[PDB]
Design a binder for these strands. Structure first.
Ligand SMILES: [Zn+2]
Ligand SMILES: [Zn+2]
Ligand SMILES: [Zn+2]
Lengths: 610, 57, 295, 284, 169, 104, 201, 47, 100, 59
RNA sequence: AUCGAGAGGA
DNA sequence: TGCTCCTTCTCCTTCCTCTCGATGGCTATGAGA
DNA sequence: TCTCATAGCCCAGGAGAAGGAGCA
């Protein structure tokens, strides 16, 4: 944080999407297909997992930006897989589209007018007209009148959306709210319930074969009934990933007019046409080395698990490429020999494993395993799901800076809205006080005093963001800085700013006390500072003991020291104890006095008290 | 290997020696005070699988 | 994202509305509970008048719309305070449901205004000792107080409501005075708001009875409504197999007829008909299933 | 034995029985001959998408790698020509290396003035009066270049040129520019170079320079190199030097009676004392 | 408080050249204020964070590296064990065990407990001139909260106090 | 101030024409002028460059010195650094993210 | 889509305008007027003088500063008008109401202003005085404002180099006044911008 | 179950309008409820 | 050039035609604790980074107290832009809000 | 320089660049000197005056 | 410094 | 021809401090006496 | 000519989905 570093831009809204393979080949850093991870015990190999195109690795430079570790974010490489893989994250979804298509005409086995009706329903749901999305079925009566009915439905939807676009019921970017999305998900769920029941083709009476999945691994095909083969002929087992790619590519090429509507919950303004390569992994991205560094202590190295996964991916890829070269050896002719029977199977079994390895790269749960040790190294799914994931460990629950923690102690001599500060916490917690002409003498007093005597100045930061510390400087090197806080405009590029001081805490500031298991908003309140001499703990008044649910047998309170005048005003006004006299639950108080005051009130106001 | 068994506590075997948990059979003596030190010879344990279970029977 | 919008309507952060007023009346709980003790406010009429000064605030707001509108609604809902609400052909909206409640002086809820006028009419003895305190001056003071005790636009009342249910819920998981019926404590509360389950542990129903129905008539109805199982009237089941192929004779000793006749309102020919209809049919179906499940 | 495991299975469980029965529906033959030739056609479509594998023999061995050796002559079966001196020393720099004024002048003060780097190296005093033939004078010039590499090695944190020119006895420009152009990460930019240029050496080229230094020392020590007194001299780590000679193909071995006969070192204390030797081929 | 630090220089068969003491090398002279010439500290010495504890010469960088005391409290040196190898001194000395000692005054905020479960935190050490004094002459050691007795129901502390006064007389 | 500004507050380089924070990088400061952040997603290769003319504004070189062209609409925003981590982690499953950044 | 990429190559890098020679007598009119809009901050320490504050904090530090989005060098700004973010203002008001970012007192807002941009393009005519003399290049004095570089191989053999050296025109007399040359490329190499000059290429 | 809802979000192509408080802090902007529900704007002079 | 002008005019359209007239502003004329706290904090943050002086300093080293002192006399030149769930915003200045 | 405090983020034009002749530019020179009346930046002023002396006949 | 395992505190 | 009830899988969760460990095995080379 | 002696590396807690086993 800096209040002398304003940010001009901002994030306004978030859009999604899927990168494809050729786009990553256009943008990313370097094709990396080298399993060399440890090149003679001390080196990063070029073109490998620790290439300097991927950033910097343990006081090496960069082959992309040529800068230090503190200037490069690390660059994103790309593995070129041998074969196009699935994306498991979307897997079961396209599995439904694996079973809803007619294999011959490349349409869906439901009636074409029915899918046209669902498409018009979802187009009306794109603009908030659920009224139209249930009045659409009003329009009913060879395929000439069927095409007429399609044009009736199309003109009905077009005129309804034109009437919506007449007034301001929907802007140009579309209409989308909660009830709209609920109706959309009900119709998509009913749509997928209907696209798995029609056995025959409703276009030409054919029979698509039966499919069954292993869950993330393979697809098994079943031969159909002899009556079904008889019906197919009069009128018309492991499969590979490329067969799935070719089938779903032709299905998406023939069904663009409806799957433009299914996979979009808004008006698709930029005309993003859905293709098969939106679901597929011909390439894998490669993370920056900076986000993949092994943990180092002196010499001890804990090597990252994603390095192991991605190295196994590259090793399996080069094994598949070597077997591709062996098949290039067989394709001279080599037809009078069954010698290529085994290694081809040693292709296909290995052709399983890379899928499993991608199922071992992103997932760690659903795979096979080399058992009896049961050590799952973390896939990127399991690094995102729990308290030990990312949304709680690093997004919400963050260990903070400029904070303190202690056991506390009673103090009935300070007020209710006050806190007692020991000198050990009064030296290691600073405030970024700027330089201004009204408080210039107090800041020169803090500069003369220094980091060893309360109160004082520790870090004088210049207008370039450069620091000057005082933690080891002498007394006169501090006192010479007294006349060195009124520097004029040297550089006009940074002339409007002034100097800053990370000064010590004093009475004109405010902190935020907290007790760690919280249950309500009055379990975390601001308190006005008073620095105490000869003190080890934090000091508390008894009126706080109702709100924090505190007992003085060894509490543990945290103290966030706020870092902005905005936060000072909010803690001093919006969350001070003076404004928290009552419960928000029922209206009772939680503050007041405790048992010594209570018994003294019993004895004192009695009528034998002269 | 016995130094590994006492320095980590992971019971590593094949038949399991007919038990329930596969870890945590070793306790540091903790001779900070003699009351603690004599408590760590009568301190019996019910089972880590029962500490896992939230049923309060 | 459940907070107080500027129109005092509970919406989500995209405008998805949840309620139109905070509790129906926009009264924050923080400044709530001194709208029940009016005699204390009369006792500090001078202090609450010196605090809430109406002189420096009359120049920004209309004062004579909600008063007339509220007096019209008061006369109408004292005129028809005996018909039920379905027979009540509904007139126009209540007072808060028309006006900005924090702009017009006198835009109050109905129950507060009713208890205000009931307090001002119950204490006719008291205001003769007053200096001239009427319905009007005290009403203007309490309406200025009602305007100054409304909730701010933009308070995290979803968070306040969530914490005000969570914090007294941590005083729970106590096996309370339950046996002297339903699931109690946190296992009730998490069943209600989070899970939304239909399989209630002990689902019940409370039926009010009329006044002419005596206790004997109501308990006769309780013996009428009750579910009766067959094994409730079965003393002994005696199965004697003899293998003519394999066969077995079933002898059932029941109880006395007057016993379940008085307790469960069942004759022996109802017992005959229920052995005739459903028992032997399901028994034969179970025998067929157990025969088929060997192969 | 898998069928015996299934025979124990079918009696054994209901969860492992179902699991391995699913695995047997998973096990079954994933290749037939018509499927084999269809997959041969699909591998021809893999030829169509043949994102080609790297050559892994010349790009991954001859180019920039872990510790780049000097330009080795594997084809030379002569062990004294595995590193020819025209490969290490370029002719462009060799054509202006003249040390006739060094052996011509008899003053050792001016001779140490004419070395580019000045230290307490015992190797300089060991190999100045020992070499007597002028016919190996270019080899002596090689030793000169060795001292010149010291002017790079222990003076690498000098982050510019003119202050690095303040560490040498004003040599001809071509040696220093050849070293700073062949061995350094050239960071371009004239935004600071008109004031002061700033670039340094990555540690991979630093181990390359260590390989060049140890190859020059490998020349001048009868191609049988000392380890432990050199480890006293190099001021570096012992196994570091062992690794640097295992890169350069030097078999770092113990001593027979021949090395006790030659180097004057005791064979009875040679189980831990190391000596680097050479043979004909190249490493793997 | 007693602590233990095992400084080893043999974590990596011959080439360990890190030798204790000092080689023929320059080093800032005020190390002998806290150390001795054999690479060891003076036993019983004021140790504060920012002071060397074990120093040793190595020729691998022509350098005498030290081991700075890294702990928050100021300490003192208790016992310096010097451990050799179990076989017949194939190397010289390479392992130094050091016992630190740290003072602990009874401070404010410390946790003291009686023998009835009633633990507590010493909030302030109260001056004896500010103590309540008895007619016999004495002042108490620990004043305790009297309101803890109804809720916790510790009536046996009365019994222990009365019997202890009886035994003290 | 607390949950963002005091733990991992960071700037970020964004190319507004692509709307991402990760693929942008720093160009090598060559002999002409100072360096400039650029976009790898909005980049013209020297391989084809529609040559089946580029003015001297957008030609820049990476660490090996290959000529790229594009990615000048660059601005710095205020993010947590763990957002950059999550951006680099969601691409491992194959997810593009897109961040609308006004002023457009 | 193959039709998008050709136009995205040839049209977006294509400039706006071309400068003609005045009556084929003088030089080009490379000093052109263009209206721009921008979005800049404002310090509170010049809040009493906010317009000149914006000038001295974003525009006066843009003097003689090259941008490729304007294509050249600005010779001065004119017509600063803040687009106020409050409607019903009608451009005749003094209580302009600028949006403040919720962390800093530097308030960002939109501004229209005109620029007087000097931008040369490919294949143009410029002139230069005698500024320096060397052996193979003469940096010409562009409008008494900039420096012009000349590569050696673009010089025909009719030019007479004499010898410090000097260039002699094909007329044979020493050169004077404003010498004509052709612009090939624009460069920023140096403390300020420069240009690539030619005579036959 | 972040991945399943993220799958459904990508297959819906959710333009997240960024109004939920937890969403606004995962992205990391000034949260809505309180001193972020509105904006302060500066009244400036003319000269 | 011209498409930028068109997007500019669409921006000024959606700004202008989502505005609220001064006749339509019918919220409360009060100032909530959030509004007052934000005004105080933002004005003190301006003064700490040299806002122009319009109130007496009285030698107070606390800029937040200087902000409260300056709020005590309605000297502050700021306008609260109240947003709605539509996004149509009212503008309430300091001069037309009952402080406390 | 990478901060937004000293650098505008968005810069675009709205109209076609009108080729204003040396008349309005000379008028802007004279009125610019007059408005600045009503060192690298002063060297920018000096070069901006040498633009006028350049077109005059004797720089 | 990652994973386990153990201990202890409000 | 089309439409329901009975079985599986397949999913998920209070705060802090300290310590103490943390791959086996299949082959090369390489002297010693 | 084997014996060491090591380098270099390979038991909650229901709710849903989802599809078979019969039925108009
Ligand atoms: Zn880089
Ligand atoms: Zn078909
Ligand atoms: Zn881009």
């Amino acid at each position: 944080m800096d209040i002398s570093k304003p940010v001009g831009s901002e994030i306004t809204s978030v859009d999604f999407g899927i990168l494809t393979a050729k786009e990553i080949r256009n943008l990313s850093a370097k094709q990396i297909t080298n399993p060399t991870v440890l090149d003679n015990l001390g080196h990063p190999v070029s073109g490998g997992l620790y290439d300097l195109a991927l950033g910097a690795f343990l006081r090496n430079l960069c082959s992309t930006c040529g800068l230090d570790e503190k200037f490069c974010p690390g660059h994103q490489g790309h593995i070129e897989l041998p074969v196009p893989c699935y994306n498991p994250l979307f897997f079961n979804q396209l599995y439904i589209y694996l079973r809803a298509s007619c294999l011959f005409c490349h349409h869906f086995r439901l009636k074409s007018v029915e899918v046209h009706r669902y498409a018009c329903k979802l187009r009306l749901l794109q603009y908030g007209l659920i009224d139209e999305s249930y009045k659409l079925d009003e329009i009913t009566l060879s395929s000439t009148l069927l095409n007429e009915l399609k044009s009736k439905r199309s003109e009905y939807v077009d005129m309804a959306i034109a009437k919506a676009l007449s007034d301001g019921r929907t802007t140009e970017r579309g209409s989308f709210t909660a009830t709209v999305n609920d109706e959309r998900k009900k119709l998509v769920h009913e749509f997928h319930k209907k696209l798995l029941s029609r056995g025959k083709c409703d276009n030409c009476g054919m029979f698509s074969p039966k499919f069954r999945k292993d869950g993330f691994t393979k697809i098994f095909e079943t031969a159909l009934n002899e009556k079904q083969i008889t019906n197919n002929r009069v009128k018309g087992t492991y499969i590979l990933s490329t067969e799935v790619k070719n089938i779903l590519d032709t299905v998406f090429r023939k069904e663009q007019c409806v799957l433009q509507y299914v996979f979009h919950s808004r008006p698709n303004l930029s005309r993003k046409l859905v293709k098969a390569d939106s679901f597929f992994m011909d390439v894998l991205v490669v993370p920056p080395t900076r986000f993949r560094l092994p943990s180092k202590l002196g010499e001890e190295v804990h090597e990252n698990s994603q390095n192991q996964l991605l190295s196994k991916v590259l090793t399996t890829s080069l094994l598949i490429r070597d077997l591709n070269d062996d098949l290039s050896k067989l394709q001279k002719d080599k037809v009078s020999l069954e010698d290529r029977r085994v290694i081809f199977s040693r292709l296909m079994n290995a052709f399983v494993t890379i899928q499993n390895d991608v199922n071992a790269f992103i997932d760690s749960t659903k795979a096979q395993g080399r058992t009896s040790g049961k050590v799952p190294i973390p896939g990127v799914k399991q690094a995102l799901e729990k308290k030990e994931g990312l949304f709680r460990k690093h997004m919400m629950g963050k260990r903070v800076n400029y904070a303190a923690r202690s056991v506390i102690s009673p103090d009935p001599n300070i007020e209710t809205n006050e806190i007692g500060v020991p000198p050990v916490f009064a030296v290691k917690l600073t405030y970024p006080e700027p330089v201004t002409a009204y408080n210039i003498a107090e800041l020169r007093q803090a500069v003369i005093n220094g980091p060893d005597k309360w109160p004082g100045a520790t870090q004088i930061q210049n207008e370039d963001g450069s620091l000057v510390s005082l933690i080891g400087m002498s007394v006169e090197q501090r006192k010479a800085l007294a006349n060195q806080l009124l520097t004029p405009s040297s550089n006009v590029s940074t002339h409007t700013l002034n100097k800053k001081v990370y000064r010590h805490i004093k009475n004109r500031d405010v902190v935020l006390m907290n007790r760690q298991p919280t249950l309500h908003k009055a379990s975390m309140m601001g308190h006005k500072v008073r620095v105490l001499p000869n003190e080890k703990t934090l000091r508390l008044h008894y009126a706080n003991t109702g709100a924090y649910n505190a007992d003085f047998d060894g509490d543990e309170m945290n103290m966030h020291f706020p870092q902005n005048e905005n936060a000072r005003a909010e803690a001093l006004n919006l969350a001070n104890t003076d404004s928290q006299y009552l419960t928000p639950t029922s209206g009772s108080p939680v503050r007041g006095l405790i048992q010594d005051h209570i018994s003294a009130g019993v004895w004192l106001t009695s009528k034998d008290s002269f | 290997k016995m130094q590994y068994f006492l320095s980590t506590g992971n019971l590593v075997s094949q038949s399991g020696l007919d038990l329930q948990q596969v870890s945590g059979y070793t306790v540091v003596a903790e001779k900070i005070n003699f009351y603690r030190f004599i408590s760590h010879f009568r301190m019996v344990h019910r089972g880590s699988f029962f500490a896992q279970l939230k049923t309060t029977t | 994202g459940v907070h107080v919008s500027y129109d005092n309507s509970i919406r989500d952060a995209d405008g998805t509305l949840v309620q139109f007023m905070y509790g129906g009346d926009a009264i924050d709980i923080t400044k709530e509970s001194h709208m029940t003790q009016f005699e204390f406010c009369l006792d500090n009429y001078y202090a609450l008048l010196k605090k809430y000064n109406p002189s420096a605030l009359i120049e920004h707001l209309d004062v004579e719309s909600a008063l007339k509108y509220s007096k019209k609604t008061l006369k109408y809902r004292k005129k028809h305070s005996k018909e039920p609400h379905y027979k009540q052909s509904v007139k126009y909206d209540p007072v808060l449901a028309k006006y900005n409640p924090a702009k017009y002086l006198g835009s109050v809820s109905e129950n507060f205004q009713d208890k205000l006028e009931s307090f001002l009419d119950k204490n006719s003895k008291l205001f003769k000792s007053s200096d001239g305190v009427n319905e009007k001056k005290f009403r203007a003071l309490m309406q200025l107080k009602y305007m100054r005790s409304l909730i701010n636009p933009g308070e995290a009342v979803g968070i306040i409501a969530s914490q005000s249910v969570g914090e007294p819920s941590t005083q729970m998981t106590l096996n309370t005075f339950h046996f002297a019926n339903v699931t109690l404590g946190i296992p009730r509360l998490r069943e209600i708001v989070m899970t939304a389950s239909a399989a209630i542990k002990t689902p019940q129903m409370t039926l009010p009875i009329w006044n002419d129905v005596s206790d004997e008539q109501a308990d006769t109805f309780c013996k009428s409504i009750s579910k009766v199982l067959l094994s409730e009237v079965i003393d002994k089941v005696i199965v004697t197999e003899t293998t003519a192929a394999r066969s077995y004779v079933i002898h059932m000793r029941f109880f006395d007829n007057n016993e379940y006749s008085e307790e469960y309102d069942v004759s022996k020919e109802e017992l005959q008909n229920v052995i005739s209809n459903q028992f032997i049919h399901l028994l034969e179906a179970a025998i067929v299933k157990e025969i088929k499940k060997q192969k | 034995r898998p069928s015996a495991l299934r025979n124990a299975l079918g009696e054994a469980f209901g969860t492992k029985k179902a699991k391995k029965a699913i695995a047997d529906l998973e096990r079954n033959r994933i290749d037939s001959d018509k499927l084999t030739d269809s997959a041969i056609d699909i591998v021809d479509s893999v030829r169509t998408a043949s994102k080609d594998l790297p050559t892994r023999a010349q790009l991954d061995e001859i180019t920039s790698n872990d510790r780049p050796t000097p330009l080795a002559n594997i084809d030379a079966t002569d062990v004294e020509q595995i590193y020819p001196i025209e490969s290490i020393i370029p002719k462009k720099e060799l054509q202006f290396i003249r040390v006739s004024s060094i052996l011509k002048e008899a003053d050792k003060e001016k001779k140490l003035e004419l070395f580019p780097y000045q230290n307490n190296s015992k190797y300089v005093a060991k190999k100045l009066d020992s070499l007597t033939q002028p016919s190996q004078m270019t080899k002596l010039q090689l030793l000169y270049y060795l001292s010149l590499l010291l002017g790079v090695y222990e003076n690498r944190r000098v982050n510019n040129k003119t202050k690095l020119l303040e560490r040498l006895n004003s040599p001809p420009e071509i040696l220093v520019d050849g070293i700073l152009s062949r061995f350094t990460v050239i960071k371009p930019g004239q935004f600071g170079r008109s004031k002061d240029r700033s670039y340094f050496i990555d540690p991979q080229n630093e181990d390359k320079i260590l390989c060049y230094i140890l190859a020059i020392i490998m020349h001048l020590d009868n191609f049988i190199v000392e380890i432990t007194p050199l480890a006293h001299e190099l001021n570096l780590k012992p196994s570091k030097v062992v690794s640097l000679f295992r890169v350069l193909g030097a078999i770092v071995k113990g001593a027979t009676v021949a090395q006790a006969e030659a180097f004057g070192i005791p064979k009875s204390t040679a189980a831990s004392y190391k000596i680097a030797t050479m043979k004909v081929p190249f490493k793997l | 408080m007693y602590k233990t630090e095992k400084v080893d220089l043999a974590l990596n068969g011959d080439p360990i050249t890190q030798h204790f003491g000092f080689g023929n090398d320059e080093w800032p002279k005020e190390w002998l204020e806290k150390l001795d010439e054999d690479g060891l500290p003076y036993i019983g010495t004021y140790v504060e964070e920012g002071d060397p504890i074990c120093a040793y010469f190595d020729d691998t960088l022509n350098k005498t590296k030290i081991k700075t005391y890294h702990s928050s409290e100021p300490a003192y040196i208790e016992e310096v064990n010097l451990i050799g190898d179990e076989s017949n001194k194939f190397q010289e000395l390479q392992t130094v065990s050091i016992k630190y000692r740290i003072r602990r005054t009874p401070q404010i905020g410390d946790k003291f407990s009686s023998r009835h479960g009633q633990k507590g935190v010493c909030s302030r050490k109260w001056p004896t001139i500010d103590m309540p004094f008895s007619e016999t002459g004495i002042q108490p050691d620990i004043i305790i909260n009297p309101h803890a007795f109804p809720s916790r129901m510790t009536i046996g502390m009365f019994v222990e106090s009365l019997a202890g006064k009886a035994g003290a007389l | 101030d607390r949950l963002l500004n005091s733990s991992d507050y960071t700037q970020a380089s964004v190319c507004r024409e692509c709307g991402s924070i990760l693929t942008t990088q720093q160009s090598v400061p060559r002999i002409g002028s100072i360096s400039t952040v650029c976009c790898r997603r909005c980049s013209m290769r020297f391989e084809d460059a529609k040559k089946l003319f580029i003015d001297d504004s957008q030609i820049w070189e990476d660490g090996q010195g290959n000529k790229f062209v594009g990615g000048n609409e660059t601005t710095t925003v205020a993010i947590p650094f763990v957002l950059k981590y999550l951006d680099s982690e969601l691409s491992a499953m194959g997810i593009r993210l897109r961040y609308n950044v006004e002023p457009k | 889509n193959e039709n998008r990429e050709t136009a995205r190559f040839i049209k977006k890098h294509k400039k706006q305008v071309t400068n003609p020679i005045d009556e084929k007598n003088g030089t080009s009119n490379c000093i052109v007027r263009v209206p721009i809009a921008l979005y800049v901050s404002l310090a509170p320490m010049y809040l009493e003088n906010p317009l000149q504050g914006v000038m001295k904090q974003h525009l006066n530090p843009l003097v003689m500063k090259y941008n490729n989005k304007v294509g050249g060098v600005v010779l001065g700004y004119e017509g600063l008008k803040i687009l106020d973010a409050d409607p019903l203002s009608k451009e005749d008001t003094s209580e302009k109401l600028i949006k403040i970012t919720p962390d800093t007192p530097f308030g960002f807002t939109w501004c229209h202003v005109n620029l007087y941009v000097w931008q040369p393009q490919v294949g143009d005519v410029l002139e230069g005085y005698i500024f320096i003399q060397s052996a193979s290049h003469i940096g010409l004095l562009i409008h008494d404002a900039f420096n012009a570089s000349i590569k050696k191989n673009n010089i025909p053999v009719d030019w007479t180099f004499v010898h410090l050296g000097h260039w002699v025109d094909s007329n044979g007399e020493p050169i004077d006044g404003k010498l004509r040359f052709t612009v090939r490329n624009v460069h920023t190499t140096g403390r300020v911008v420069s240009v690539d000059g030619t005579l036959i290429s | 179950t972040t991945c399943q809802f993220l799958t459904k979000a990508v297959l819906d192509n959710e333009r997240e309008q960024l109004d939920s408080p937890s969403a606004r802090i995962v992205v990391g902007k000034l949260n809505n409820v309180g001193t972020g529900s509105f904006d302060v704007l500066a009244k400036v002079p003319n000269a | 050039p011209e498409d930028f002008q068109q997007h500019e005019q669409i921006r000024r359209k959606t700004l202008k035609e989502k505005a609220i007239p001064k006749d339509q502003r019918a919220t409360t004329p009060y100032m909530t604790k959030y509004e007052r706290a934000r005004i105080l904090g933002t004005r003190a943050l301006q003064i700490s980074m040299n806002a122009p002086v319009f109130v007496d300093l009285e030698g107070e080293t606390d800029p937040l107290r200087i902000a409260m002192k300056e709020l005590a006399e309605k000297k502050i030149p700021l306008v609260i832009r109240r947003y709605l769930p539509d996004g149509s915003f009212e503008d309430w200045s300091v001069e037309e809000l009952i402080v406390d | 320089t990478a901060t937004t405090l000293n650098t505008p983020v968005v810069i675009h034009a709205t109209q076609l660049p009108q080729h204003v002749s040396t008349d309005e530019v000379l008028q802007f020179l004279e009125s610019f000197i007059d408005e600045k009346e009503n060192t690298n930046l002063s060297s920018s002023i000096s070069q901006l005056k040498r633009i006028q002396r350049d077109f005059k006949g004797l720089p």
